[PDB]
Amino acid sequence: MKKLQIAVGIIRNENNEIFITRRAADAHMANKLEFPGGKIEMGETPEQAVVRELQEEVGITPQHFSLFEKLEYEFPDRHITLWFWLVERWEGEPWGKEGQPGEWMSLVGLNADDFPPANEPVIAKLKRL
Ligand SMILES: Nc1nc2c([nH]c(=O)n2[C@H]2C[C@H](O)[C@@H](COP(=O)(O)O)O2)c(=O)[nH]1
Ligand SMILES: [Mg+2]
User: What residues bind 8-oxo-dGTP, as annotated?
Assistant: First the structure.
């Protein structure tokens, strides 16, 4: 069968709000309010897959780790796996290569609408809260 993995993480900061890449003052799309963790799949392990993206989507040296939640669902042969890593802190500024630089925003009320629907499955459950 065919499978496809994805890993994502909310970058926590001092303020306790997590820097989510969104808008970025006139960018490609305002619906890109997502976080690092794109291309972890490739051919690594559930852990060693994101570990490589973690630095690729942050670049800096942040106290980032742990898994807040992961969405596991398998479609007609083509299965999908989304692993969310609960980040705690980040030194300097996050760069890596996730997307359009975002601002430190409170995760207490993340918006699945303003963010890519590709990750809505997991965020939906919480966002709906
Ligand atoms: N249609 C299609 N989408 C895929 C495949 N593999 C794969 O990771 N994806 C998806 C799932 C991920 O959310 C995202 C990761 O970045 P890419 O699109 O660049 O591979 O794309 C695939 O073989 N076919
Ligand atoms: Mg990547």
Answer: 23, 28, 34-37, 119
